[PDB]
Amino acid sequence: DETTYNVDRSASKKYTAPLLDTPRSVTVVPKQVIKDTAAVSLQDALRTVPGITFGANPTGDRPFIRGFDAQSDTYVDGVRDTQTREIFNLEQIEVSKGPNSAFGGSLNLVSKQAKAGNFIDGGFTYGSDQTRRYTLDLNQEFLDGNAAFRLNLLKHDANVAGRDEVDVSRWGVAPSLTFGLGSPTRVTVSHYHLESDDTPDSGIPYAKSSDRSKHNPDKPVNVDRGNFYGLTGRDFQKSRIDTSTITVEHDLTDSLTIRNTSRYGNSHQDYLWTQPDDSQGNINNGSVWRRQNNRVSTTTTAVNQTDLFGEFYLGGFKNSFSTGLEFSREDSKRDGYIVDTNTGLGSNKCNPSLIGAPSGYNCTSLENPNPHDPWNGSITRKYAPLNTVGTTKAIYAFDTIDLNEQWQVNIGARFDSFETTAKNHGVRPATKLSDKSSFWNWQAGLVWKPVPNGSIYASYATSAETTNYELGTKWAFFNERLELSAAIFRTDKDNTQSRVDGVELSASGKLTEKWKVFAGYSYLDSELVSNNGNEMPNTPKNSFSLWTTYDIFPKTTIGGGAFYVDKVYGDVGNTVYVPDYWRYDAMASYKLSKNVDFQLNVQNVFDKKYFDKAYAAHYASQAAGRTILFSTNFHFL
């Protein structure tokens, strides 16, 4: 069933048990939720899972999970990645909220692969924000059903509702080949390519009060909804990602599969954007310094991962296990631009008399900025990069033991070894600095099943310094079409000292035959333990996500979502924040025939102005306003 709102198993076979019986908080955002919400990105899609905030970049692509930074815990099919992620090539999104030695929490993005079946799918979406999105998803068998070819294509252009001039443009191509369908030896080859060229948002500056502190923190200034402080003549955000993956699987016995995966990745970023005022206090006289930020970056990644997984029997118990070796190499080159933003008054100071041409357009108006100002300062590349070469070697082992039909034990360990060399051409003479380290990690879980469709679990994880305790329960109702979850947990971290205590509730699947739900609640009580007693940044204390659809007639579905996010602090010092908000979404779909769907989405039904990322200083990112999307989807199977 491809229309399910509940997914009962992970895709990666490092999990040794179904999700009901896995002793960890895991939420899968299934394909159908991604389609029903009409999500056009990873962040858009993750609004359905509460307590995941993004922070920091001209668009902050760094997730925070249970109040902890997870930029370098994003996986594509269980392997690390070389950046703003699109969803056209994804089947589902797997969110692990606590640790998992198999890989603060992590995201695992499952790619669409060539597989058995013949289909041609495609869609176009037109929007009130000028969205023009075209997708094609073609999968064809060949070699008489022993192999398959799949091609996913994307073209996406859009403005942003309630933001002057800000826009996005991207396209993608994802070819895939799989061989040995149904046989004991399978070979898969994938390539992924995405290129983008955006006009980056400036965001909105924090108010800057004379008495700003932990006690009276500042929030974004209140100005017209569309205000953009950047420059259409200057600012740009260009990226390219290329990823090749080769996977070989062989069944050695009926109980044992060996798997080798090779990934080569290559990503370029060339960004230059504006930040409003960088806390210079010019906003208090009605003006804004257009501070310039930038990054030029190239990264190369090479990974090889060999896994052995399956079953063995010992003392009368089944042991469902996975074990492996991982070797990788990352090359990164960080450079930038040198840009003249001198206002003429102490470099970065402004007032209304300097707005426009007297500041070389480095000052603008707080209330009525002009993004078309013909700014014309020098831009030159530094050509003096920080070049880093990193090596990793890891070994891991995971085992689930069925003691009887009521009791299971999970144990997992992982050892990582790391070597880096950094050459910095930004200082004279250039420096060469090396570093060596390792990371031990292990976890244990206990599952009690009073009845088959019921689960109560304890869990302990440590890494060496971090410690996680979790205690939870999961239940499957209405013929295992509805999963309910509840968890409590504590995370303790030394040399961050910090603590996060929390509660998580989930509901996923069918309530009745016509009524589906995908929903969660998250409570995060976080603390630094002077900043002693402050909340963690990017960690909403309360959040709630509800997505629901109802099959109101045959051929017709209606639906909506309600999302709450509590206030969020930008800094450890708790001096800046973005306020809490409610957002509501609506949808309707009509099956015109077996081959054509029509879909309407209304995002942010009440046109709430709110801020989806709070940065540590200077400013916050404003989310999109009300957006209306009409989709036409074709599918021939």
Numbering used by the authors: 27 to 82, 87 to 112, 115 to 135, 142 to 502, 531 to 562, 576 to 608, 625 to 732
What does the published report state?
In this Trojan horse approach, the transport of drug conjugates is redirected via TonB-dependent receptors (TBDR), which are involved in the uptake of essential nutrients, including iron. By in silico screening, we further identified a PiuA orthologue, termed PiuD, present in clinical isolates, including strain LESB58. PiuD has a similar crystal structure as PiuA and is involved in the transport of the siderophore-drug conjugates BAL30072, MC-1, and cefiderocol in strain LESB58. An in silico screen identified PiuD in LESB58 and other clinical isolates as a homologue of PiuA, sharing 60% amino acid identity.
Here, we determined the structure of PiuD from strain 39016, which shows 99.6% amino acid identity with PiuD (PALES_48941) from LESB58. The obtained PiuD structure was similar to that of PiuA from PAO1. The crystallographic asymmetric unit has two monomers (denoted A and B). PiuD comprised two domains, a 22-stranded transmembrane β-barrel and an N-terminal plug domain (residues 27 to 156) folded inside the barrel. The plug domain has two β-sheets and two α-helices, which together, occluded the central pore. As often occurs in the TBDR structures, some of the extracellular loops were not experimentally located in the PiuD structure. In the B monomer, these regions, namely, NL1 (83 and 84), NL3 (113 and 114), the loop 138 to 141 of the plug domain, L7 (504 to 530), L8 (564 to 572), and L9 (609 to 624), were presumed to be disordered. As a consequence of the disorder, one side of the extracellular β-barrel was absent. The closest structural relatives were PiuA of A. baumannii (root mean square deviation [RMSD] of 1.1 Å over 701 residues) and P. aeruginosa (1.1 Å over 656 residues) and the pyochelin receptor FptA from P. aeruginosa (1.8 Å over 655 residues). Like PiuA, PiuD also has a distinctive cluster of aromatic and positively charged residues located inside the pore at the extracellular face.
